[PDB]
Amino acid sequence: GIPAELRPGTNQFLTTDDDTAAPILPGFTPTPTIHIPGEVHSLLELCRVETILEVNNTTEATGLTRLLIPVSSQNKADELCAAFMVDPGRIGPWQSTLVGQICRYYTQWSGSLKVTFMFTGSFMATGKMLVAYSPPGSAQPANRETAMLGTHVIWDFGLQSSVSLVIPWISNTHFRTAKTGGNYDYYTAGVVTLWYQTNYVVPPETPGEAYIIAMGAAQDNFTLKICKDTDEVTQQAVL
Amino acid sequence: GIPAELRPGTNQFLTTDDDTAAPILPGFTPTPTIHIPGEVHSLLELCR
Amino acid sequence: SDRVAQLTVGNSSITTQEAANIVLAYGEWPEYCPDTDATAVDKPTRPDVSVNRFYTLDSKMWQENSTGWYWKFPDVLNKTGVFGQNAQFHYLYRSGFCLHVQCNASKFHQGALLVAVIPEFVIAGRGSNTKPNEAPHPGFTTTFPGTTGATFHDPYVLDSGVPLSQALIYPHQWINLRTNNCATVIVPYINAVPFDSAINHSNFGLIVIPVSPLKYSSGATTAIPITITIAPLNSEFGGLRQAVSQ
Amino acid sequence: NINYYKDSYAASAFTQDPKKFTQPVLDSIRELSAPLN
Amino acid sequence: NINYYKDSYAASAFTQDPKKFTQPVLDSIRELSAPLN
Amino acid sequence: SVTNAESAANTTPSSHRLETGRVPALQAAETGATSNATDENMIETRCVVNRNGVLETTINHFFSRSGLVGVVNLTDTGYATWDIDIMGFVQLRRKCEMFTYMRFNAEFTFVTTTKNGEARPYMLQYMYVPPGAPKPTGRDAFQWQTATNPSVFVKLTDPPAQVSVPFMSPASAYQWFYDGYPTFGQHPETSNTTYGLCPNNMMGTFAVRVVSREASQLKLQTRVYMKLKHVRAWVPRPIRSQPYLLKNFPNYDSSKITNSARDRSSIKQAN
Amino acid sequence: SVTNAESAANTTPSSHRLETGRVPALQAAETGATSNATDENMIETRCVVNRNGVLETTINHFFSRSGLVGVVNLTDTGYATWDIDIMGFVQLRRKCEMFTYMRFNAEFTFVTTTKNGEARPYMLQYMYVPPGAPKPTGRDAFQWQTATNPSVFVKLTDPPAQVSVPFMSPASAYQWFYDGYPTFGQHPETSNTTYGLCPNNMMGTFAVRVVSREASQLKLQTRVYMKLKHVRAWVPRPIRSQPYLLKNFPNYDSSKITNSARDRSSIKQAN
Ligand SMILES: CCCCCCCCCCCCC/C=C/[C@H](O)[C@H](N)CO
Ligand SMILES: CCCCCCCCCCCCC/C=C/[C@H](O)[C@H](N)CO
C-alpha cells in the first residue's frame, strides 16, 4: 500500500468538526419535499422582529403587568419616567425579548439596536416624552438637561403614537462580549431613559393613567459571532 | 481502502515541525486588520 | 385610502372605517394545491362559494379582569353550514383562512389586545409531575374548544410554557382602542403534509389577549363586546365517505 | 466536497429574506411617509 | 500549501525596510556629506 | 424581495433635515409590522464600509454541532433498548423547539464508558430496529442475526462509532409540535394521554448488547450524540422560558411560574 | 523604500581617497539616526558575492516553534481549570515581549503524563470555555455536554492532541503592554490592582476532566505547548534584562538590580 504517518488529532471525536460518515440505508431516497410557508435561512431574520421588553420587571408586580410602563399626570415638571440598560446579553428588560435570547447563544454581538414605544391610552389624552440614549461614562443622569446632552428623540402623542428610537453603534472596538458585570464593565452600551417633555394632559371624564409598551429589535447592522451556551435551562436528571 | 505502511517518525510531536492542525471554530473570520505604524518583518531590522 | 376598507368573500362583506393594514402571514397567498405536492389519487371537490364566505362566531365579553381567549380554527367550523358538512363527510382538508376581529370602543376608553395565530398551537397541562404515566393532561374541551372558545389560565406563558412577549414572531396585530377598532390576518395553509383531516387536527389557533387592561370613567358603556368573523379562503376536500362528527 | 459513497446524504455540507417576518403587510408602507392617512 | 479545511487559519505557512528604524529623519542625510552644516 | 449578503449592511452619510411632511420616526405598531426607521433618517451619521462576517449565524452553522441525544444504561437482561427521541435532554431540545418544522439528516456518535470509566477490550453490537421489526428478547436470540437491519460492531478500545442517518420520516418534515390526535373516536375529558403525539416522528428502537455466549460481568453507559446537517427550518416560534418537566409533553408548573426577567429595585433606576 | 533580499549584501572594490570635503566617517548621533558608514568608504576592500541565506531570521521562522505555555495539574474536585495566559513561563514570554503588538494564530498541543510518568488507557476531555460561558462545577455536571463549546476527547495512550486556534481578539492585535485602566472612576493611590490589564487579551478558560461516572484514582499533569503561526509584529521594544516576578505585571526588584554586563578588572584591560 501507500506509506503514511499518523499525526496528533488521530482518534479524537471533535464536536464541531465537519467530516463525513458512513451511511446506514443504502440506495435511500427520502420523502419528496413540499412547500411550507415561512422558511428561515439565518438567525438574523428573527432578530429584526419587535418584541415586548419587560421594563417593569420589579417586585410587587403581577404576571402580565410587568410588560407595561405606567404614565400619569405629574405635578412637578421635567420628572423622570423610566430607565433601563441597553446590553442585550445582560439581565433585565432585554431578557424577555427575542434578540436577547438569540444573542445569548452567541458570545460577541455588534450593530445598532431599535426600541419602539407604543402608547396604550385614551384617544383624548395627549402629551410628550423624551427618550434619551446615553453612551457609557457616568451613571444614570439625574436631570433632564443632563439627558438632553446624549442622543434623544422627542415624541408626542397623536394619531400615530408609535415612535421608534434607534440606538446607534457607538463603541471603541468592533464587537462586545455578551457578558457584563465587574471586570466586564468595559462592554456596557449605555442607558436608555424616558423623561416627561411637558406633561400628560387629559380632559375630564377620561382615565388619568395609561401605559407604554416598549419593544426591542436589531437593525441591518446586527452581527453575531462565537456560539456559546445559554444559562436559562437547568437539568438535574433525565426527563 | 488504500494500502499503506507506517514509517519511523509516526506518533511523534516534533517541536519545530511545519504541519497543519484541525480548527476549533468553524466558519470563523477574525477582526479586520488596521494600519499600525512600525511593522517589523525580520530580526535584521533590529540589529542595525 | 388606508383606513377605510371592505372585504367581500362569497356572499358576505366586511366594512371598516378605522383599521390597521391587512397582514399576510409569511408573505404567501393561499392558493390551491399543485399537482407536484399532491399525493392523493381521487379528485377533490371545490365548492368555492358555499364554503368560502364569512362565518361569524359568538361574542366574547370584554371586562376589566379578563385573561384571554383561544380557538382551534379547523375545529371551530365543524358544525356551521356547508363547510362543516363537507369537513364531516370528507376525510382530507386544505384551505387558507382570513380572520377579522372587531372590538370597537369610544374615544374615552383605553386598552390593548394582542391578536395572533400560532401554527400547531399545543395546549400544555398545568401541574408539577415528572412521572409520565400520572401527569395531568388537558381535556377534550380544553384542547378543542370549538365555536364557543376557551379562556386562558396563565396568559403570561400562553398556557404552553412560552412567553407571550416573544409571541410577536407570529403573524399578529394590535387592537389599540385609540388607533383601530379591528384587526385582520390572512393565513395560508401551513402544514408539513399536503392534505390533512379537519376533525382530529387543528392547524393553528387565534389568541386575543388583554395586554393593557380596559379602563374608563364612570358613565361610559361598561361591557365591551368582541366579535370574530372568519373566512376559509380556497377550500379543498377529499375522501368522501360516511359522516363522522369526532 | 468530495464524497466517497453512492448516497448523497453521507456527504459534508447567504440567502436572507426578512421582509416576510418584519413587514408582512399587504399595503406597502414607505420609509419617510406616515404609515396611516 | 495544500489545505484540507474550509477555514484558512488551519493551513501551513523576504520584505525588509530598515529605513524606518535606522534613519527615520525628515531631512535626508547623504553618505559622503557631513550631517549638519 | 430576496437579497444576498457577504457581510453586514453599510451606512451612508446623512445631513440635517428641516422640512415638514417627511416623518421617518412615527410608525404604526398596530399594523403588525416592524419599524423600519434606519440610522440615516434618525441622527446625523458618517459612512462606514462594514465588512463584518454574518456567515456563521445561518441554520446550518447553528445546528451542525454534536450535542447529546441519549444515554443508554447497560448495567449488566444482557441487552439494552432505547426509544429514539431527541427530547430527553434540555440542551438540544430547546434549539430544536425554536422552530415548528425541521427537515435534516443525522450523524450519530456512540461513546461507551464503563462503571468508573475505562475501555476494556470487549465487543459491542449496536442494532437499529425500525417500527415493526422484531425487538430482541434475549442476549443470544435470533433478532441479532441482522440479516436486514443496520448493525455496528465496535470495541471499547476503538474510536467512537459514527454513522450518517437520512431523512426517514413518512411526512415531508419533522414537526416538534402537533395539535391533534393520532386516532379517531370519542376522546376523554379527564386524561388525554395521546394529545400532541405525532406518529410521523416515532423512528424506532436502538438496541445494544455485548457479543458473547456467556455473561460478561460489566456495567456500561453508551452516549448517543447527534450532529444535524443539511438542515432546513420552517415557521419559527418563541424559545421556552419555563423549566421542562416531561419528554413528549410541554408541561409546566401552574404555581411557581418563573419570570423571564430578574427583579430590580424600581422602574426609575436602571442600575 | 522597500527592498527585497534573497541573501545578504555584497561588497564592491574600493580604492584610496585623497580629497577634501568628502567625509563619510563623521556622523551625527544627536539627530536620532543610525550611522550609515559602509565598508567601501572606510577601508580599501575587495569584491565578494555574498550568498549567505538570511531567510531564517524573519518573524515567521523566529516564532513558529512550539514552546511551553501552561502546565495544568489534575492531582485527582474531579476537574481542572486553567486561565489562558501565555505569560506563565519566562521562555516564550520574553520573545513575545520583544514586541508591542502581535497578531497571530495558535496551534495548541496537549501532552499528558501521570504521577511518575506513564500512559494508562483512560479517557480525557479538554473543553474550551469562552468568556461568559458557564464553567463546569463538577465532574459530571451539564456544562460537559458541550453542545456549542469546542471539546476534544483523547486517550493517554494516543499521540498528543493538536488543534489550530484563530485570531480571537475583539481588537485588531494582541498588545503585551497596556498603559491604562479598563474601568472608569476614581483610582486609588495605594494599590492599583487593575493597572496594565488589557481586557482584549483575556480569552477564556481551559478545563480538563476524566470522562467517568466514578472517580478514577490517578493524578496527572497536562502540558499545553503553543506554536505561533501567520504572525505579524508591530512596534519592537527592548528585551527584558531583569528577572520576572509576576505573571500579569512587569514587576522587578528595587534593591538588588542585576547589571546587564558582567564585571571585569578595569576598563583598560579587554581580557
Ligand atoms: C446502530 C447504527 C444506526 C443507528 C440508526 C438510528 C437512526 C434512526 C433514527 C433517526 C433519527 C431521526 C432524528 C430524530 C427523529 C425524531 O425527530 C425524534 N423522534 C424527535 O422526537
Ligand atoms: C480544547 C481545544 C481547544 C482549545 C482552545 C483554546 C484556544 C483559545 C485561546 C486562544 C489563545 C490566544 C493566544 C493568547 C492570548 C493572549 O495573548 C494571552 N491571554 C496573553 O496574555
Q: Write the secondary structure of G176-231 as one string of H (helix), E (strand) and C (coil).
A: CCCCCCCCCCCCCCCCCCCCCCCCCCCCCEEEEEECCCCCCCCEEEEEEEECCEEE
Nearest to A64 by CA among A56, A72, A73, A74: A56
User: Are the beta carbons of C244 and C69 closer than 8 angstroms?
Assistant: no
Q: Which of F31, F114, A152, A32 has the alpha carbon at shortest distance from C24?
A: F31
Instruction: Write out chain F in H/E/C secondary structure.
Output: CCEECCCCCCECCCCCCCCCCCCCCECCHHHCCCCCCCHHHCCCCCCECCCCCCHHHEHHHHHCCCCCCEEEEEECCCEEEEECCCCCCCCHHHHHCCEEEEEEEEEEEEEEEECCCCCCCCEEEEEEECCCCCCCCCCCCHHHHCCCCCEEEEECCCCCEEEEECCCCCCCCEECCCCECCCCCCCCCCCCCCCCCCCCCCCCEEEEEECCCCCCCCEEEEEEEECCEEEEEEEECCCCCCCCCCCCCCCECCCCCCCCCCCCCCCCCCC
Alpha helices by DSSP H, listed for chain G, are 59-63, 92-96
Asked whether the beta carbons of F237 and F98 are under 8 A apart, the reply is: yes
Vertex G118 angle, CA G114 and G124, to 5°:
60
- Across the interface, whether the CB atoms of F56 and B32 are under 8 A apart is answered no
Q: Residue A146: in which H helix or E strand, if any?
A: helix A144-147
Q: Are strands C23-24 and C182-187 parallel, antiparallel or unpaired?
A: parallel
- CA pair distance C68, C70, nearest whole angstrom: 7
Residue with cell 450535542: F67
Which segments within G115-190 are labelled E, that is strand? Answer: 123-129, 151-155, 161-165, 174-175
Q: Establish whether residue F85 lines the binding site of ligand 1, counting it when its CB lies within 6 angstroms of any ligand atom.
A: yes
Grid-cell match 445494544, residue found:
F208
For ligand 1, say whether the CB of F84 is within 6 Å of any of its atoms.
yes
Question: Max alpha carbon distance in chain E (Å)?
Answer: 62
* Cβ atoms < 10 Å from Cβ of A10: 14
Measure the CA–CA gap between A9 and G107, rounded to whole angstroms. Answer: 12
- Placement of cell 496551534 in the chain: G107
Q: Which three-class secondary structure state does DSSP give residue E12? A: coil
* Lookup result for grid cell 518573524: G59
3-state helix, strand, coil in chain G (%, to 5): 10, 25, 65
Q: Which residue has the cell 462545577?
A: G137
Q: Phi and psi at residue F100, in whole multiples of 5°?
A: -90, -45
* Alpha carbons C202 and D29: distance in angstroms, whole number: 33
Residue F158 falls in which region: left (phi positive, over 0), alpha (psi -120 to 50) or beta: beta
Alpha-carbon gap, residue G198 to G196, rounded angstroms: 6
C-alpha cell at A132: 434619551
Phi-psi group of B24: left, alpha or beta (phi > 0 → left; psi -120 to 50 → alpha; rest → beta) = alpha
Cell numbers at residue F145, please? 442475526
Interface of A with F in 197-236 (CB under 8 A): 213, 215, 217, 219-225, 227, 229-230, 232-235
The reply to whether ligand 1 has any atom less than 6 angstroms from the CB of F130 is: no
As given in the structure block, the three cell numbers for residue C126 are: 398545568
Show residues of chain A in contact with C169, CB under 8 Å: 46, 49, 51, 98
The three three-digit cell numbers of residue F45, written as one number: 451619521
How many whole angstroms separate alpha carbon C100 and alpha carbon C96? 14
Residues G200 and G226: their CA atoms lie apart, in Å, by 19
Task: Count CA within 13 A, CB hemisphere, residue F55.
Answer: 12
Q: Kindly provide the resolution of this structure in angstroms, with one decimal.
A: 3.2
Residue G90 contacts E where some CB pair is shorter than 8 Å = no
Q: Which amino acid would we find at residue F111?
A: V
Q: Which three cell numbers stand for residue A155?
A: 415624541
Protein residue with its CA nearest to atom 16 in ligand 1: F201
Give all strands of the β-sheet with A176-177 in edge-to-edge order: A176-177, A106-110, A223-227
Amino acid at A10: T
Those residues with Cβ within 8 angstroms of residue G41's Cβ, 6 or more apart along the chain or in another chain: E31, E32, G14, G17, G24, G25
**How far apart are alpha carbons A99 and A189 in whole angstroms?**
15
Which residue among A8, A176, A228 places its CB closest to the CB of G130?
A: A228
* All structural domains of chain D with their residue ranges: 1-37
DSSP structural state of residue G94 = H
Q: Which of A37, A169, G187 is nearest to F45 (CA)?
A: A169
D16 CB-near residues (< 8 Å, 6+ apart): A41, A42, A44, A45, F2, F3, F4, F5
Which chain C residue's Cα is nearest to A209? Answer: C215
Contacts of A237 (CB under 8 A, 6+ apart): none
Distance CA(G79)–CA(G101), nearest Å, equals 34
Write out the three cell numbers for G246.
509576576
**What are the domain boundaries of chain C?**
1-246
With CA atoms as reference, report the closest residue to A210 among F32, C115, C219, C178: C178
Q: What is the 3-state secondary structure (H, E, C) of C47-98?
A: CCCCCCCCEECCCEEECCCCCCEECCHHHHCCCCHHHHHHHHHCCEEECCEE
Q: Which three cell numbers stand for residue G225?
A: 505547548
- Measured CA to CA in angstroms, residue F179 lies from B34, C135, D12 at distances of 54, 19, 35
Closest to F111 measured CA to CA, from F154, F77, F149, F81: F154
| F75 CB-contact burial (10 Å; exposed 0-12 / middle 13-18 / buried 19+) | exposed
Question: Looking at beta carbons, which residues of chain A come within 8 Å of F45?
Answer: 168
The distance between the two most distant Cα atoms of chain F, rounded to a whole number of Å, is 91
End-to-end CA distance of chain G: 42
Distance CA A95, CA A216 (A): 10
Q: How far apart are CA F155 and CA A102, in angstroms?
A: 40
Cell numbers describing residue B34: 488596521
Grid-cell match 362559494, residue found: C49
Q: G84: CA distance to ligand 2 center in Å?
A: 5
Domain residues for F263?
1-271
Question: Determined by which method?
Answer: cryo-EM
**What DSSP string describes A100-115?**
HHHTTSEEEEES-EEE
Torsion of Cα atoms, G200 then B35 then G2 then G229, to 10°: 30
- CA G248 – CA G245 distance, rounded (Å): 10
**How many of the other CB atoms lie within 10 Å of CB of F209?**
23
Report helix, strand or coil for G19: coil
C-alpha F173/C-alpha F130 separation (Å) is 18
3-state secondary structure of G93: helix
Question: How far apart are the CA of B43 and the nearest CA of chain F, in angstroms?
Answer: 33
- Residues F210, F120 contacting (CB under 8 angstroms): no
**Per-residue cell: F148:** 436486514
What is the sign of the dihedral through the CA atoms of E22, E28, E29 and E32?
positive
C152: number of Cβ within 10 Å? 19
Residue of G69, A155, A189 lying closest to F37 (CA atoms): A155
Is residue A86 within 8 Å of A97, Cβ to Cβ? no
Q: Report whether G173 contacts G103 (CB < 8 A).
A: yes
Hey, what's the cell of C137? 393532561
Ligand found nearest the CA of G224: 2
Ligand 2 first shell, C-beta below 6 A: B 24; G 84-87, 106, 108, 126-128, 150, 152, 163, 165, 168, 174, 201, 203-204, 206
DSSP percent split of chain B into helix, strand, coil, nearest 5: 5, 15, 75
Between CA G162 and CA G169, with CA G165 as vertex, the angle to 5 degrees is 155
Q: Is residue E14 classed as helix, strand or coil in its secondary structure?
A: coil
* DSSP-based three-state secondary structure for A218: strand
Within 10 angstroms of residue C190's Cβ, the number of other Cβ atoms is 23
**Burial grade of C220 (CB within 10 A; 0-12, 13-18, 19 or more):** middle
Q: Output the nine-digit C-alpha cell for C205.
A: 389557533
Dist. CA G131–CA F122, nearest whole Å = 41
Rg (CA), chain G: 26
How would DSSP label each residue in A167-189? Answer: E----SSS-EES--SSTTTTS--
User: Residues F52, F8: contact at Cβ < 8 Å?
Assistant: yes
How many domains is chain G partitioned into structurally?
1
CB pairs B-G closer than 8 Å: 83
Q: Compute the nearest-CA separation of C26 from chain D (Å).
A: 5
Tell me, yes or no, if B20 comes closer than 8 A to chain E by beta carbon: yes
Burial class (CB in 10 A: 0-12, 13-18, 19+), C153: middle
Sign of torsion, CA F134 F137 F142 F146? positive
Q: Which amino acid is at F255?
A: S
Cα separations (Å) of G220 from F119, G115, G143?
Answer: 18, 6, 22
Length of chain D, please?
37
Question: Exposed, middle or buried: residue G150 (CB in 10 Å: 0-12, 13-18, 19+)?
Answer: buried
Instruction: Say if CB A60 and CB A74 are below 8 A apart.
Output: no
Element (H, E) at C140: helix C140-143
Any residues with CB less than 8 A from the CB of F109 and at least 6 apart, and which?
A13, F66, F160, F161, F162, F224, F225, F226, F227
Please give the grid coordinates belonging to residue D13. Answer: 455540507
Q: What is d(CA C9, CA C23) in angstroms, rounded to the nearest whole number?
A: 17
Of residues F182, F238, F254, nearest to C162 (C-beta) = F238
Contact D15, A41 (CB under 8 A): yes
* Three-state DSSP state, A161: coil
Chain centroid offset of residue G202 CA = 15
Residue E23 in contact with partner chain B when CB distance is under 8 A: no
User: What's phi and psi for D35, nearest 5 deg?
Assistant: -70, -35
